[PDB]
Amino acid sequence: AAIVAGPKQNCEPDLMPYARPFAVGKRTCSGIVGLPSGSDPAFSQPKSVLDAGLTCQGASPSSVSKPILLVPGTGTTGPQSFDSNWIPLSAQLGYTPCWISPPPFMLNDTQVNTEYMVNAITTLYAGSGNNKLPVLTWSQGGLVAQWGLTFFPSIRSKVDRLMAFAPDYKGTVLASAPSVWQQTTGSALTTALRNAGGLTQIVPTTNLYSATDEIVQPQVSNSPLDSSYLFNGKNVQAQAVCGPLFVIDHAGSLTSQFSYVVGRSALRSTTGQARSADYGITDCNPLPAND
Amino acid sequence: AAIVAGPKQNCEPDLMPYARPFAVGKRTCSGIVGLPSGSDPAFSQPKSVLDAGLTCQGASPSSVSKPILLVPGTGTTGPQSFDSNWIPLSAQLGYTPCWISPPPFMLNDTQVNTEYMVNAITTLYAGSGNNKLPVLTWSQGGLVAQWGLTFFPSIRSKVDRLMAFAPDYKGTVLASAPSVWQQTTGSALTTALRNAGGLTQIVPTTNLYSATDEIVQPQVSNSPLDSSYLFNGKNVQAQAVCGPLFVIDHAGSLTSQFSYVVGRSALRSTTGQARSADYGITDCNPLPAND
Numbered sequence: 001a002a003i004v005a006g007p008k009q010n011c012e013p014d015l016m017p018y019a020r021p022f023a024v025g026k027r028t029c030s031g032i033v034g035l036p037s038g039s040d041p042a043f044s045q046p047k048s049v050l051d052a053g054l055t056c057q058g059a060s061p062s063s064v065s066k067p068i069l070l071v072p073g074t075g076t077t078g079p080q081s082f083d084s085n086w087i088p089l090s091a092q093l094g095y096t097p098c099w100i101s102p103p104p105f106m107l108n109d110t111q112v113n114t115e116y117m118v119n120a121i122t123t124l125y126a127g128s129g130n131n132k133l134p135v136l137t138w139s140q141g142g143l144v145a146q147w148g149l150t151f152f153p154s155i156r157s158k159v160d161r162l163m164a165f166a167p168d169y170k171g172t173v174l175a176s177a178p179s180v181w182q183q184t185t186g187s188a189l190t191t192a193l194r195n196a197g198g199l200t201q202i203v204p205t206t207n208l209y210s211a212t213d214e215i216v217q218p219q220v221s222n223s224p225l226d227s228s229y230l231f232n233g234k235n236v237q238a239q240a241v242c243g244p245l246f247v248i249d250h251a252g253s254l255t256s257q258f259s260y261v262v263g264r265s266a267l268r269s270t271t272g273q274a275r276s277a278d279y280g281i282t283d284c285n286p287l288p289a290n291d
Numbered sequence: 292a293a294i295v296a297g298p299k300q301n302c303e304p305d306l307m308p309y310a311r312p313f314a315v316g317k318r319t320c321s322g323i324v325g326l327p328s329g330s331d332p333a334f335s336q337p338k339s340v341l342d343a344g345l346t347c348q349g350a351s352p353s354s355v356s357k358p359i360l361l362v363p364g365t366g367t368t369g370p371q372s373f374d375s376n377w378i379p380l381s382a383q384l385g386y387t388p389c390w391i392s393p394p395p396f397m398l399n400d401t402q403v404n405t406e407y408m409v410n411a412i413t414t415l416y417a418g419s420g421n422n423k424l425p426v427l428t429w430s431q432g433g434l435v436a437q438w439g440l441t442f443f444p445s446i447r448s449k450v451d452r453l454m455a456f457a458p459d460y461k462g463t464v465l466a467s468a469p470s471v472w473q474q475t476t477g478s479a480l481t482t483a484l485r486n487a488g489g490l491t492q493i494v495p496t497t498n499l500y501s502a503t504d505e506i507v508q509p510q511v512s513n514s515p516l517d518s519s520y521l522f523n524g525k526n527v528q529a530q531a532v533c534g535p536l537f538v539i540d541h542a543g544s545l546t547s548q549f550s551y552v553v554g555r556s557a558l559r560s561t562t563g564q565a566r567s568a569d570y571g572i573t574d575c576n577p578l579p580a581n582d
């Protein structure tokens with residue numbers, strides 16, 4: 001009942017177990033609050049159904065050398081998204097291209113689409129001799145990758161890096177199919193990802209995007225406000241490097257020569273993220289890389 | 292492997308159980324996602340210790356008529372915060388004033404301070420014949436009330452309304468004691484409250500605050516950006532009603548005549564929130580109400 005201004009610390013008190021899951025990324029006395037690490041949520045789909053959506057080029061996912069998992073965009077299959085680009089480009093870099101094609105064309109529940117990716121990572125990790133593998137994505141594919149890493153603890157140590165092209169982590173304001181509702185800015189899904197701490201990278205991540213993206217917006221600030229931005233990630237907005245006259249659209253973000261140089265840098269980097277020293281003004285080419 | 296633009300719904304798919312707690316307040320096919328309703332988190336303090344912090348004027352908390360629970364601000368006890376104002380003002384309105392004085396002067400862990408309030412509500416609810424009671428707060432007291440309502444399901448049906456004066460739900464940028472760290476904008480605690488859905492009212496709530504608050508900021512926009520704002524709540528920024536020349540500081544937000552008229556309105560309202568029809572320009576008096 002007397003003087004008490006005393007209580008003085010040099011750190012914020014740790015959050016109680018019941019609130020800890022809601023402050024991932026923040027620092028308290030014990031350190032940075034990490035993501036919950038319990039058991040994986042159960043799949044709503046039979047494993048045999050999830051396996052039907054996974055394919056590797058020239059090999060079985062159960063026995064594959066240096067696999068790379070490609071996750072497609074909304075309204076497409078793995079081949080439709082990557083046949084003209086990262087399937088042959090990654091093969092040229094020494095990887096065995098693998099991809100998932102969640103039915104129907106990624107239009108269904110993003111949470112279900114994520115099951116295909118989680119199962120695929122589990123499969124390819126073991127299939128490659130229990131070795132981490134890179135994941136490369138386009139559009140919703142990135143949202144799926146981060147959703148998986150946020151809610152399925154088992155794959156966090158199985159993914160070595162994430163190279164996401166035009167990812168819509170905050171959804172888009174330019175937005176119906178189930179996944180379209182979920183990718184609309186302000187959706188319950190994008191809100192959940194943010195509130196669970198999903199806007200901070202979980203594995204070494206590189207996000208390549210464009211201010212002139214005609215599908216995903218806002219992307220114009222080259223800051224945390226952009227939909228493709230992840231805290232601690234290597235966030236590369238094309239125009240920040242190439243200037244305001246460099247125009248690549250949503251698909252160009254995945255297929256341009258600039259995108260290839262950045263992606264290649266991320267894939268070979270020992271840090272798991274693309275390095276500024278690997279690209280410059282001369283790589284600011286909007287033409288297709290596989291061309 | 293053919294046409295599929297088909298999948299078309301009129302609502303966003305429901306979130307899976309594992310993600311539902313992170314999207315409270317959002318609407319999916321089944322409706323608005325509500326707060327989790329499991330068992331109450333366990334107390335870190337012995338109940339006898341929590342009981343020592345609860346007092347009612349002229350009665351025992353275990354047998355009291357029409358109680359009102361007053362929750363004090365940082366660096367004060369219940370009497371220091373309310374002796375000159377809401378203790379006698381509420382008694383005049385027909386209530387039995389009760390309050391908690393979490394030691395030491397609300398400077399300790401806000402999560403612990405909340406235990407005192409949860410225990411107090413449980414006690415007063417039963418003590419008044421299993422009847423809901425109003426909670427009136429000042430500064431951190433409001434943060435404590437909302438933290439309790441967000442994480443302790445049992446009291447949601449025991450609190451009839453919340454009248455918060457200058458509540459710092461987003462903390463303050465003008466910010467050490469444990470609770471001071473926690474009330475600093477960007478803290479793990481304020482982040483957790485927001486991420487768990489605590490910035491939307493849980494019970495009928497009225498938030499009275501001032502743009503000229505010298506302790507809690509920002510409060511100048513009369514919008515969701517203000518620290519005292521709660522979605523669906525009756526948010527009353529003094530200057531929006533009284534104009535830019537109306538100046539009441541942090542304590543004035545609790546004790547002014549304007550504050551009394553709004554508080555009285557909230558306490559007697561059948562909606563549980565203050566009503567615009569009960570106050571106007573003539574009530575824009577900065578002088579103390581108990582005067």
Ligand SMILES: CC(=O)N[C@@H]1[C@@H](O)[C@H](O)[C@@H](CO)O[C@@H]1O
Nearest residue numbers: 102103104105107108109178298
């Ligand atoms: C896997 C697939 O393409 N078909 C499903 C269908 O079975 C399900 O009823 C519907 C809503 O859940 O979502 C998709 O249309």
Ligand SMILES: CC(=O)N[C@@H]1[C@@H](O)[C@H](O)[C@@H](CO)O[C@@H]1O
Nearest residue numbers: 007393394395396398399400469
């Ligand atoms: C109840 C009280 O006023 N004293 C506690 C003290 O026992 C505790 O060690 C410290 C840190 O938890 O917080 C306060 O100072």
Ligand SMILES: CC(=O)N[C@@H]1[C@@H](O)[C@H](O)[C@@H](CO)O[C@H]1O
Nearest residue numbers: 211218219220221222223225226
């Ligand atoms: C919402 C906001 O403030 N973001 C702005 C954006 O609107 C603007 O186009 C951009 C210019 O590059 O600068 C950002 O700070």
Ligand SMILES: CC(=O)N[C@@H]1[C@@H](O)[C@H](O)[C@@H](CO)O[C@H]1O
Nearest residue numbers: 502509510511512513514516517
């Ligand atoms: C951060 C922000 O944009 N909030 C501004 C605030 O700075 C300004 O003082 C107020 C004027 O009342 O208008 C709000 O919209």
Ligand SMILES: *[PH](O)(CCCCCC)OC
Nearest residue numbers: 073074139140175180183
């Ligand atoms: P991406 O998956 C982002 C799609 C958002 C749907 C709303 C238009 O594109 C291939």
Ligand SMILES: *[PH](O)(CCCCCC)OC
Nearest residue numbers: 364365430431466471474
């Ligand atoms: P309130 O509890 C808000 C206090 C914030 C502490 C940082 C200065 O005031 C009585």
